[PDB]
Scaffold this active site. Structure first.
Site, PDB file in Angstrom:
ATOM      1  N   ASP A 114     -31.986  27.285   2.827  1.00 41.71           N
ATOM      2  CA  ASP A 114     -31.928  27.564   4.241  1.00 41.71           C
ATOM      3  C   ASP A 114     -32.791  28.746   4.630  1.00 41.71           C
ATOM      4  O   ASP A 114     -32.435  29.915   4.402  1.00 41.71           O
ATOM      5  CB  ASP A 114     -30.493  27.860   4.655  1.00 41.71           C
TER       6      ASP A 114
ATOM      7  N   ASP B  69     -36.664  25.682  10.611  1.00 37.14           N
ATOM      8  CA  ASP B  69     -35.441  25.867   9.845  1.00 37.14           C
ATOM      9  C   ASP B  69     -35.117  24.690   8.930  1.00 37.14           C
ATOM     10  O   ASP B  69     -34.860  23.583   9.391  1.00 37.14           O
ATOM     11  CB  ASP B  69     -34.257  26.102  10.782  1.00 37.14           C
TER      12      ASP B  69
HETATM   13  C1  LIG Z   1     -26.742  33.984   8.961  1.00 39.04           C
HETATM   14  C2  LIG Z   1     -26.758  34.758  10.291  1.00 39.04           C
HETATM   15  C3  LIG Z   1     -26.406  36.118  10.269  1.00 39.04           C
HETATM   16  C4  LIG Z   1     -26.413  36.869  11.441  1.00 39.04           C
HETATM   17  N1  LIG Z   1     -26.016  38.306  11.408  1.00 39.04           N
HETATM   18  C5  LIG Z   1     -24.980  38.748  12.406  1.00 39.04           C
HETATM   19  C6  LIG Z   1     -26.581  39.217  10.376  1.00 39.04           C
HETATM   20  C7  LIG Z   1     -26.367  40.746  10.633  1.00 39.04           C
HETATM   21  N2  LIG Z   1     -26.420  41.499   9.356  1.00 39.04           N
HETATM   22  C8  LIG Z   1     -27.072  42.836   9.467  1.00 39.04           C
HETATM   23  C9  LIG Z   1     -25.088  41.625   8.801  1.00 39.04           C
HETATM   24  C10 LIG Z   1     -26.760  36.240  12.661  1.00 39.04           C
HETATM   25  C11 LIG Z   1     -27.100  34.898  12.697  1.00 39.04           C
HETATM   26  C12 LIG Z   1     -27.477  34.267  14.064  1.00 39.04           C
HETATM   27  C13 LIG Z   1     -27.108  34.140  11.499  1.00 39.04           C
HETATM   28  O1  LIG Z   1     -27.439  32.751  11.538  1.00 39.04           O
HETATM   29  C14 LIG Z   1     -26.265  31.961  11.604  1.00 39.04           C
HETATM   30  C15 LIG Z   1     -26.585  30.476  11.297  1.00 39.04           C
HETATM   31  O2  LIG Z   1     -25.725  29.709  11.052  1.00 39.04           O
HETATM   32  N3  LIG Z   1     -27.987  30.011  11.320  1.00 39.04           N
HETATM   33  C16 LIG Z   1     -28.272  28.547  11.035  1.00 39.04           C
HETATM   34  C17 LIG Z   1     -29.434  28.029  11.949  1.00 39.04           C
HETATM   35  C18 LIG Z   1     -29.014  28.019  13.432  1.00 39.04           C
HETATM   36  C19 LIG Z   1     -29.097  29.182  14.194  1.00 39.04           C
HETATM   37  C20 LIG Z   1     -28.723  29.163  15.546  1.00 39.04           C
HETATM   38  C21 LIG Z   1     -28.273  27.981  16.122  1.00 39.04           C
HETATM   39  C22 LIG Z   1     -28.183  26.811  15.353  1.00 39.04           C
HETATM   40  C23 LIG Z   1     -28.557  26.826  14.016  1.00 39.04           C
HETATM   41  C24 LIG Z   1     -28.610  28.374   9.518  1.00 39.04           C
HETATM   42  O3  LIG Z   1     -29.856  28.879   9.153  1.00 39.04           O
HETATM   43  C25 LIG Z   1     -28.391  26.891   9.145  1.00 39.04           C
HETATM   44  O4  LIG Z   1     -29.294  26.134   9.100  1.00 39.04           O
HETATM   45  N4  LIG Z   1     -27.041  26.362   8.920  1.00 39.04           N
HETATM   46  C26 LIG Z   1     -25.509  27.074   8.818  1.00 39.04           C
HETATM   47  S1  LIG Z   1     -24.876  26.401   7.591  1.00 39.04           S
HETATM   48  C27 LIG Z   1     -25.959  25.097   7.201  1.00 39.04           C
HETATM   49  C28 LIG Z   1     -25.240  23.785   6.855  1.00 39.04           C
HETATM   50  C29 LIG Z   1     -26.984  25.518   6.083  1.00 39.04           C
HETATM   51  C30 LIG Z   1     -26.855  24.938   8.577  1.00 39.04           C
HETATM   52  C31 LIG Z   1     -26.152  24.154   9.702  1.00 39.04           C
HETATM   53  O5  LIG Z   1     -25.235  24.558  10.317  1.00 39.04           O
HETATM   54  N5  LIG Z   1     -26.683  22.785   9.924  1.00 39.04           N
HETATM   55  C32 LIG Z   1     -26.071  21.854  10.898  1.00 39.04           C
HETATM   56  C33 LIG Z   1     -26.706  21.918  12.290  1.00 39.04           C
HETATM   57  C34 LIG Z   1     -27.037  23.025  13.113  1.00 39.04           C
HETATM   58  C35 LIG Z   1     -27.614  22.785  14.380  1.00 39.04           C
HETATM   59  C36 LIG Z   1     -27.860  21.461  14.804  1.00 39.04           C
HETATM   60  C37 LIG Z   1     -27.509  20.366  13.974  1.00 39.04           C
HETATM   61  C38 LIG Z   1     -26.929  20.599  12.711  1.00 39.04           C
HETATM   62  C39 LIG Z   1     -26.475  19.609  11.606  1.00 39.04           C
HETATM   63  C40 LIG Z   1     -26.366  20.456  10.356  1.00 39.04           C
HETATM   64  O6  LIG Z   1     -27.606  20.447   9.644  1.00 39.04           O
END
Ligand SMILES: Cc1cc(N(C)CCN(C)C)cc(C)c1OCC(=O)N[C@@H](Cc1ccccc1)[C@H](O)C(=O)N1CSC(C)(C)[C@H]1C(=O)N[C@H]1c2ccccc2C[C@H]1O
Ligand SMILES: C[C@H](CCC(=O)NCCC[N+](C)(C)CCCS(=O)(=O)[O-])[C@H]1CC[C@H]2[C@@H]3[C@H](O)C[C@@H]4C[C@H](O)CC[C@]4(C)[C@H]3C[C@H](O)[C@]12C
Length: 328
Positions: free
Chosen positions: A33, A213
Site C-alpha cells: 500500500d 494508490d
Molecule cells: C494511514 C494514514 C495515517 C494518517 N495519520 C493520522 C498519520 C499521522 N501520524 C503522524 C501518526 C492519516 C491518513 C489519512 C492515513 O491514511 C488512511 C488510509 O486508510 N489510506 C488508504 C487510502 C485512502 C485514503 C483516503 C480515502 C480513501 C482511501 C490506504 O492507503 C489504503 O489503500 N487502504 C486502507 S486499508 C487497505 C485495504 C490497504 C486500503 C482500503 O481501504 N481499500 C478499499 C477502498 C478504499 C477506497 C475505495 C474503494 C476501496 C476498496 C478497497 O480496496
C-alpha cells in the site's frame, strides 16, 4: 540489479505480495500500500476471530526480535487494527533489514475485510511523516544501507490470466513498459499525489489532486463530479452500497482523461468495469466510488495501475507513469 517481489492477483480486484519477518523467515502475505507508511503482521498473541486462518508472527522463535511493546492503534479509512510495536529482521525479495513494525493482536475493527480476504498484513510504501512511530520507509532505508541503487520502487501489476506482476525496488526496468515514461512532480510532502486536469467527456476539473494508490481497488471521484457523470448514463446503484451496475456494453460509459503539460493518461470502460455474470447476464459493476476530500481529489487506484506502470521516486519526489507492457 534490483529487488523484485512477485505480485499475485486475487480475483482481478486486488493483488498481494509476500515478505518475511524474523530470522527464522516466518512467511506473510501483504497488501502493498503506497498510501500508508507502517508494516504490520498478526501476532500469535492475537485474540480475535480474523487471526484464525492467518500466518501469525511469533517473536519468541526469532533471535533477531527486539522487544518494544509501545501500544499502537492503526486507523485506516476501511477499519482499525491494534497491537504494539516490535522490531525484527524484515526480508523483502532478496534484501533484509532490521525494521520496526506493529504486532497486531486485535483485528475486529477491520472486519469483514480481513476474514474475507487472504492477506495477513499490510506493508506500507508511503512517506515517513505519514507513519506512526516515525519509521523510515523500507526503500529509503535500503538505499541508505547501499543495498539498492535508487530510493524508488515500481509497480507492474498482474493481469488476471495474462501475467503476474512485480513490485521492483531500486530501479526502473524497461521490460515493464512501452512508450514514454512521464514524471509528474508530487504536489504534497507526504502523499504520492500529483496535479492533473481531470476530463470525463464534457465534465472537467482543473488541477485536481490525483493520488496514485496501490491499496485502493477502485477509482475514486468527487461526489459532485460523479453525479454529473452518472446523469442519464443508464446505470443503477446497488441498494445500501456505493456501487453502480451497468450493462457491460453500455455505449454511454465515458473515458477518464487526466492531463498535465507533460503527459496524458486515459482510462476506458474496459479498465474500470468488473463483470458480474453470476449476478446477471451482460452485467458489470463500475469500479468507481464517489468520495469527497477537503480539496477535490481522485484516487487512481488499482484500475489505473493495471493499465499504467508506475514509478514512485522518493529522491526526485515524483511519480513516473507509462503504459504497462501487455505481456512479459
Ligand atoms: C494511514 C494514514 C495515517 C494518517 N495519520 C493520522 C498519520 C499521522 N501520524 C503522524 C501518526 C492519516 C491518513 C489519512 C492515513 O491514511 C488512511 C488510509 O486508510 N489510506 C488508504 C487510502 C485512502 C485514503 C483516503 C480515502 C480513501 C482511501 C490506504 O492507503 C489504503 O489503500 N487502504 C486502507 S486499508 C487497505 C485495504 C490497504 C486500503 C482500503 O481501504 N481499500 C478499499 C477502498 C478504499 C477506497 C475505495 C474503494 C476501496 C476498496 C478497497 O480496496
Ligand atoms: C472511505 C469512504 C468514506 C468513509 C468516511 O466518510 N469517513 C471515514 C471515517 C468509505 C465510504 C464507503 C466505504 C466502502 C463501503 O463500505 C463498501 C465496501 C465495504 C467493504 O468492507 C470493502 C470496502 C468498501 C469498498 C468500503 C471502503 C471505504 O471505507 C468506503 C469507500
Amino acid at each position: 540489479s534490483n529487488d523484485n517481489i512477485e505480485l499475485v492477483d486475487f480475483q482481478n480486484i486486488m493483488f498481494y505480495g509476500d515478505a518475511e519477518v524474523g530470522d527464522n523467515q516466518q512467511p506473510f502475505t501483504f497488501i502493498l500500500d503506497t498510501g500508508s507508511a507502517n508494516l504490520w503482521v498478526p501476532s500469535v498473541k492475537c485474540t480475535t476471530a480474523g487471526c484464525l486462518t492467518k500466518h501469525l508472527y511469533d517473536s519468541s522463535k526469532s533471535r533477531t526480535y527486539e522487544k518494544d511493546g509501545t501500544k499502537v492503534e492503526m486507523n485506516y479509512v476501511s477499519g482499525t487494527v491494534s497491537g504494539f510495536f516490535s522490531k525484527d529482521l524484515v526480508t523483502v525479495g532478496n534484501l533484509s533489514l532490521p525494521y520496526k513494525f506493529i504486532e497486531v493482536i486485535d483485528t475486529n475493527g477491520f472486519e469483514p475485510t480481513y476474514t474475507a480476504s487472504t492477506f495477513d498484513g499490510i506493508l506500507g510504501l508511503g512517506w515517513k511523516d505519514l507513519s506512526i512511530g516515525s519509521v523510515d520507509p523500507i526503500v529509503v532505508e535500503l538505499k541508505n544501507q547501499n543495498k539498492i541503487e535508487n530510493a524508488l520502487f515500481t509497480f507492474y501489476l498482474p493481469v488476471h490470466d495474462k501475467h503476474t506482476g512485480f513490485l521492483t525496488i531500486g530501479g526502473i526496468e524497461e521490460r515493464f513498459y512501452e512508450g514514454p515514461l512521464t514524471y509528474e512532480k508530487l504536489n504534497h510532502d507526504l502523499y504520492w499525489q500529483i496535479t492533473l486536469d481531470a476530463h470525463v467527456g464534457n465534465i472537467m476539473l482543473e488541477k485536481a489532486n490525483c493520488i496514485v494508490d496501490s491499496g485502493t481497488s477502485a477509482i475514486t471521484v468527487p461526489t459532485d463530479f460523479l453525479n454529473k457523470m452518472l446523469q442519464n448514463l443508464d446505470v443503477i446503484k446497488v441498494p445500501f452500497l456505493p456501487f453502480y451496475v451497468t450493462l457491460c456494453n453500455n455505449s454511454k460509459l465515458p473515458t477518464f482523461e487526466f492531463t498535465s503539460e507533460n503527459g496524458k493518461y486515459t482510462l476506458e470502460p474496459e479498465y474500470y468495469l468488473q463483470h458480474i455474470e453470476d449476478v446477471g447476464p451482460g452485467l458489470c459493476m463500475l469500479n468507481i466510488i464517489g468520495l469527497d476530500f477537503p480539496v477535490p481529489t481522485f484516487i487512481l487506484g488499482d484500475p489505473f495501475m493495471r493499465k499504467y506502470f508506475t514509478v514512485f521516486d522518493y529522491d526526485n519526489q515524483s511519480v513516473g507513469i507509462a503504459l504497462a507492457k501487455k505481456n512479459l
